[PDB]
Amino acid sequence: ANPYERGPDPTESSIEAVRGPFAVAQTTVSRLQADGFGGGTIYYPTDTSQGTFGAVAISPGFTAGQESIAWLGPRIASQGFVVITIDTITRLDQPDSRGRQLQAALDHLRTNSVVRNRIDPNRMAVMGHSMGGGGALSAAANNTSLEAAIPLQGWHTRKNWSSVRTPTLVVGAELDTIAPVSSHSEAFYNSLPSDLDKAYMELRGASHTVSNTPDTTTAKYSIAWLKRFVDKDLRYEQFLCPAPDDFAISEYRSTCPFHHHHHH
Ligand SMILES: *[C@@H]1O[C@H](CO)[C@@H](O[C@@H]2O[C@H](CO)[C@@H](O)[C@H](O)[C@H]2NC(C)=O)[C@H](O)[C@H]1NC(C)=O
């Protein structure tokens, strides 16, 4: 039995839900309290009776505040995760710096007085939009212990991610002119190792700003990815393999079926 399964058996409805099965509360981390990042908001399930939860850090992109990705906080946390949406030290920080700040935000959770006993410190993930998604890839390349990475319309000058050993969902926007998929998202997917559990999801007709207000497709598959890999929850593979049928997805590539390591 998988000790990390949380919540009821999922359906497409449950992963599309704006609020998941877990009631959530929040706490604020000021810049003074934040070593190595610009502060943030932590969303967490109040129900402790099922055990601890994996942790997720989410970064905004260049010139953007926490507000540009804040909606992901409660939407993911209510599926059974402790999620910190960060501000960066400055809004002009570059992608690798954002990766270091994502890692610093995860490390903060380990001793945060409100959530330190709610996280499993060894099951953590990174996400981000635009340069923050470049940061998510950078954090994974710099920390092979991370359990999942999700760049959303990621932007980075580094195109080669062959050293990443963290299951990665790359979400591109078809009509993105800021981080065009042909030179950013798709190139990232192509250079991730072939033996990695990975997927590329292109959002039909979408512009760069698709991640800055609620997008059900982004939320539902981020949730399924975090469940499948942060929690090793095989109940969620059904949504990722075979390729999803959503109209909002114009292209899907993956290494389905994903690896299931076992001692049977
Ligand atoms: C990978 O993580 C390490 C550890 O945080 C980073 O190395 C630090 O980088 C900062 C500024 O970049 C330096 O001030 C520290 O002295 C470095 N620490 C060590 C132990 O070397 C490294 O930059 C990260 N890599 C990337 C690409 O962001």
UniProtKB/TrEMBL annotation:
Mg(2+) binds at D245. InterPro entries: AB_hydrolase_fold, FrsA_esterase, PET_hydrolase/cutinase-like. Residues 1-257 form the PET hydrolase/cutinase-like domain. Disulfide bonds join C241-C256. Keywords: Hydrolase, Metal-binding. The keyword Metal-binding applies. One of its GO terms (molecular function) is hydrolase activity, acting on ester bonds. It holds the Pfam family PETase. This is Polyester Hydrolase Leipzig 7 (PHL-7), catalysis-deficient S131A mutant. It comes from unidentified.
